[PDB]
Design a protein around this motif. Structure first.
Motif, PDB file in Angstrom:
ATOM      1  N   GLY A 215      18.085 -47.428  58.938  1.00 24.48           N
ATOM      2  CA  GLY A 215      16.682 -47.579  59.307  1.00 24.48           C
ATOM      3  C   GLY A 215      16.193 -46.704  60.153  1.00 24.48           C
ATOM      4  O   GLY A 215      14.566 -46.284  60.592  1.00 24.48           O
ATOM      5  N   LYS A 216      17.120 -45.732  61.432  1.00 20.77           N
ATOM      6  CA  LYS A 216      16.728 -45.248  62.587  1.00 20.77           C
ATOM      7  C   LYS A 216      16.618 -43.518  62.095  1.00 20.77           C
ATOM      8  O   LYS A 216      15.682 -43.523  63.129  1.00 20.77           O
ATOM      9  CB  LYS A 216      17.840 -45.416  63.811  1.00 20.77           C
ATOM     10  CG  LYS A 216      17.880 -44.840  64.791  1.00 20.77           C
ATOM     11  CD  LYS A 216      19.108 -44.234  65.623  1.00 20.77           C
ATOM     12  CE  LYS A 216      19.740 -46.061  66.219  1.00 20.77           C
ATOM     13  NZ  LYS A 216      21.261 -46.383  66.651  1.00 20.77           N
ATOM     14  N   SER A 217      16.936 -43.671  61.420  1.00 21.77           N
ATOM     15  CA  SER A 217      16.385 -41.983  61.031  1.00 21.77           C
ATOM     16  C   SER A 217      15.511 -41.941  60.287  1.00 21.77           C
ATOM     17  O   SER A 217      14.752 -40.851  60.408  1.00 21.77           O
ATOM     18  CB  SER A 217      17.367 -41.641  59.437  1.00 21.77           C
ATOM     19  OG  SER A 217      18.750 -40.927  60.193  1.00 21.77           O
ATOM     20  N   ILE A 218      15.234 -43.835  60.004  1.00 21.79           N
ATOM     21  CA  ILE A 218      13.020 -43.470  59.540  1.00 21.79           C
ATOM     22  C   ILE A 218      12.002 -43.389  61.119  1.00 21.79           C
ATOM     23  O   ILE A 218      11.145 -42.903  61.151  1.00 21.79           O
ATOM     24  CB  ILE A 218      13.184 -44.374  58.410  1.00 21.79           C
ATOM     25  CG1 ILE A 218      13.092 -43.475  57.090  1.00 21.79           C
ATOM     26  CG2 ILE A 218      11.717 -44.223  57.897  1.00 21.79           C
ATOM     27  CD1 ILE A 218      12.914 -44.201  55.667  1.00 21.79           C
ATOM     28  N   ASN A 219      12.109 -44.336  61.426  1.00 23.47           N
ATOM     29  CA  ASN A 219      11.761 -44.787  62.604  1.00 23.47           C
ATOM     30  C   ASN A 219      11.578 -43.428  63.722  1.00 23.47           C
ATOM     31  O   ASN A 219      10.943 -43.386  63.928  1.00 23.47           O
ATOM     32  CB  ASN A 219      12.596 -45.757  63.572  1.00 23.47           C
ATOM     33  CG  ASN A 219      11.358 -46.392  64.221  1.00 23.47           C
ATOM     34  OD1 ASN A 219      10.539 -46.486  64.103  1.00 23.47           O
ATOM     35  ND2 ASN A 219      12.327 -47.675  64.519  1.00 23.47           N
ATOM     36  N   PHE A 220      12.981 -43.182  63.721  1.00 23.58           N
ATOM     37  CA  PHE A 220      12.674 -41.258  64.628  1.00 23.58           C
ATOM     38  C   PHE A 220      12.214 -40.300  63.456  1.00 23.58           C
ATOM     39  O   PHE A 220      10.893 -39.212  65.010  1.00 23.58           O
ATOM     40  CB  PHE A 220      14.106 -41.276  64.837  1.00 23.58           C
ATOM     41  CG  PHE A 220      14.137 -39.710  65.447  1.00 23.58           C
ATOM     42  CD1 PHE A 220      14.329 -39.844  66.905  1.00 23.58           C
ATOM     43  CD2 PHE A 220      15.486 -38.759  64.267  1.00 23.58           C
ATOM     44  CE1 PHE A 220      14.246 -38.013  67.235  1.00 23.58           C
ATOM     45  CE2 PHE A 220      15.428 -37.673  65.454  1.00 23.58           C
ATOM     46  CZ  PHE A 220      14.528 -37.100  66.338  1.00 23.58           C
ATOM     47  N   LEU A 221      11.950 -40.213  62.966  1.00 20.35           N
ATOM     48  CA  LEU A 221      11.122 -39.450  62.091  1.00 20.35           C
ATOM     49  C   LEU A 221       9.382 -39.657  61.988  1.00 20.35           C
ATOM     50  O   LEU A 221       8.951 -38.508  62.143  1.00 20.35           O
ATOM     51  CB  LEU A 221      11.725 -39.769  60.213  1.00 20.35           C
ATOM     52  CG  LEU A 221      10.912 -38.407  59.212  1.00 20.35           C
ATOM     53  CD1 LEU A 221      10.966 -36.842  60.348  1.00 20.35           C
ATOM     54  CD2 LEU A 221      11.382 -38.937  58.483  1.00 20.35           C
TER      55      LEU A 221
END
Lengths: 270, 275, 186
Positions: A215-221
């Motif tokens: 989730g963090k990897s996509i929200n930050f992307l």
């Protein structure tokens, strides 16, 4: 008092509506060989009142969550059927006797004994913590109960699986009530917290750190990087991992050259 | 005079009397009271029987709310959304009248006991409990236009685990949004704004930042993400005109992507027009 | 009074012909559960009488124009069908009951509503000013009404587009009654 009259009131005590009055349903004459079986048969109503109160009292307040609403709903499809039995049984009365009810209602004294004891083990649990306390009733072995509760879990895991399939492929968590175990803070070190309390029992503590990382990897992307796009369950988490992260480096080495700065920060600064 | 009638037989009088109250017409014994409807059953009836009757009272009362709501929502002023919301809310009333017909025809053969009626009507006690909650939450805070399309998108999010009242509240919003999404395909692919009643999210006026301005209330709250690209898409189409399909889906953004595909062209015709 | 007898008279009140007599069709015994549905069931006839007086009072005078005919002669194609439904319902009376009628006649309680309220919105309008009132009705959104009135408009606006295609390609306007918006001076 005729035996037929008792068969008339019992058909109602099976619902809550009271000779037989309201914790046992003390009956108030008749022979002892009649009072005993009535008190034995009426103990299906007292199991019906308790389950009905939990679904009703909690179908009132709007702060029970999404998973909680599903559990309350999951207790009505297992009550309409108990409403169908009361129906067919009454038709026969218009012959059946007490020595005949015991066999008719010997099975729905068990389903009304798991459900009336499943709503007490999970009293103050809301959100995922409830989907983890109706899963601690599957370790039972009894082939009749483990195949009933393992269905209410199927109707209680749908909401928990909903969020997860949202916070993994789109990274947009939305729950006004705090249910999901990923708590946001109004971009890596903070704003993401693994909620130790609302993790379902059927997800190991390590699997819960691969979703908080996808989730963090996509929200930050999206925001900072400025870019926009069981066993099969375990394979889904890893499939969403070995693709999102491998893509995060590509956009972080071609659009920003993260590596070309490490080498250049050694030539000059070191 | 039910006091002089036997138990097993007087039940056949209530079930055929109760089978009419669910339609809206008054009854013989179980009557209705003047105006959220309250009912009166009987002074001399079995106390347990009366309690059982009360259990079937809510579906009717939850029906006398939707029926009154449907007639009122036909007003032209209410907007082009409170209209199609009342039409798609009428087909279910038709299917509820079919379910009462099939019961009377099954009542003639006597195969319909009082308890049997209580179970049969369970699909209707859940549906006419959903609509009697929207019909009372759209009129509480006066909504018309976009603010009636937002409420159908949050009341569809609360039932995320019902899977039965979530198919319904998706059937309403899919039909209560066709009028709104037909004025939008005129404001993006062209510059014209029809909006006879004041319901659209973009209104015009009569030096250029006061021509078209967003109205904040009438925003669908699922297009709130792109409330600025819509207003910016048509605005570019007008400074050139005077010089010389979308469908709603849940958890799928095929319309959010469809708007960006036109705004990305709306500028490339004006920016090139000035260079 | 038997329930079947009520089903016999109601099939006439749907037309105007009166137990049930003639503004509500007050019925005059029987149980309360029957009178209510009859009074709420004999509403199609009252609506039918309203949509019939206009197409009969204005089919009399010859000073209603050319548009006021294609309207008064398009309220009849939407009435023959209402006479086909009454045909079918009568063949089964020889079984259907009151509660069975409500579902049968739940849809023609709406068409007999728009038409009964479309002839009052346009009372004194003749010529093109009548073909203007129907356009206002289109802004409704209701997919069942906007699909009905947008058909009567396609008949009422045929004479208007007959002068227009005449006053454009030939320039010979001819209307003894003043309908076209192009008025000539002798």
């Amino acid at each position: 008092i005729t035996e037929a009259a008792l068969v008339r009131d019992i058909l109602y005590v099976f619902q809550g509506i009271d000779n037989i009055k309201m914790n046992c349903y003390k009956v108030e004459n008749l022979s002892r060989s009649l009072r005993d079986t009535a008190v034995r048969l009426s103990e299906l109503g007292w199991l019906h009142n308790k389950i009905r109160r939990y679904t009703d009292q909690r179908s009132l307040d709007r702060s029970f969550g999404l998973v909680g609403q599903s559990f309350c709903a999951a207790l009505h499809q297992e009550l309409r059927e108990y409403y169908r039995l009361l129906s067919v049984l009454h038709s026969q009365l218009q012959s059946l006797t007490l020595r005949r009810l015991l066999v008719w209602t010997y099975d729905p004294k068990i389903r009304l004994k798991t459900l009336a004891a499943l709503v007490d083990h999970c009293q103050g649990r809301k959100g995922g913590e409830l989907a983890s306390a109706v899963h601690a009733y599957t370790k039972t072995g009894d082939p009749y109960m483990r195949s009933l509760v393992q269905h209410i879990l199927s109707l209680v895991s749908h909401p928990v699986l909903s969020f997860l399939y949202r916070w993994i492929y789109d990274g947009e968590l939305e729950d006004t009530y705090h249910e999901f175990f990923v708590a946001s803070d109004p971009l890596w070190h903070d704003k993401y917290t693994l909620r130790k309390s609302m993790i379902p029992s059927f997800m190991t503590m390590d699997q819960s750190r691969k979703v908080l990382l996808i989730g963090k990897s996509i929200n930050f992307l999206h925001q900072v990087c400025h870019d926009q796009t069981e066993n099969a369950f375990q394979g889904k988490i890893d499939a969403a991992y070995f693709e999102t992260s491998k893509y995060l480096l590509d956009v972080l080495n071609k659009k920003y050259s993260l590596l070309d700065h490490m080498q250049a920060m050694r030539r000059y600064l070191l | 005079l039910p006091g002089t009638l036997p138990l097993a037989s007087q039940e056949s009088a209530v079930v055929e009397d109760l089978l009419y109250v669910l339609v809206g017409v008054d009854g013989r014994y179980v009557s209705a009271q003047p105006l959220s409807r309250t009912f009166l059953v009987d002074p001399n009836l079995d106390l347990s029987i009366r309690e059982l009757v009360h259990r079937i009272l809510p579906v009717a009362a939850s029906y006398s709310a939707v029926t009154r709501f449907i007639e009122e929502k036909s007003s032209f002023e209410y907007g082009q959304v409170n209209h199609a919301l009342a039409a798609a809310m009428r087909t279910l009333v038709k299917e509820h009248l079919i379910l009462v017909s099939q019961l009377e025809q099954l009542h003639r053969q006597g195969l319909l006991s009082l308890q049997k009626l209580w179970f049969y009507i369970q699909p209707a006690m859940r549906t006419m409990d959903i609509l009697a909650s929207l019909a009372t939450s759209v009129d509480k805070g006066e909504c018309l236009g976009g603010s009636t399309l937002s409420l159908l998108h949050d009341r569809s999010f609360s039932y995320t685990g019902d899977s039965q009242a979530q198919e319904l509240c998706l059937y309403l919003t899919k039909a209560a949004s066709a009028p709104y999404f037909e004025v939008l395909e005129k404001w993006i692919y062209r510059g014209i704004i029809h909006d006879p009643y004041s319901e659209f999210m973009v209104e015009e006026h009569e030096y250029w930042d006061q021509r078209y301005t967003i109205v904040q209330q009438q925003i669908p709250s699922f297009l709130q993400k792109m409330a600025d690209k819509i207003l910016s898409t048509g605005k570019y189409l007008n400074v050139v005109r005077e010089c010389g399909e979308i469908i709603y889906t849940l958890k799928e953004r095929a319309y959010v992507e469809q708007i960006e595909k036109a705004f990305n062209y709306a500028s490339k015709v004006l920016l090139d027009f000035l260079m």
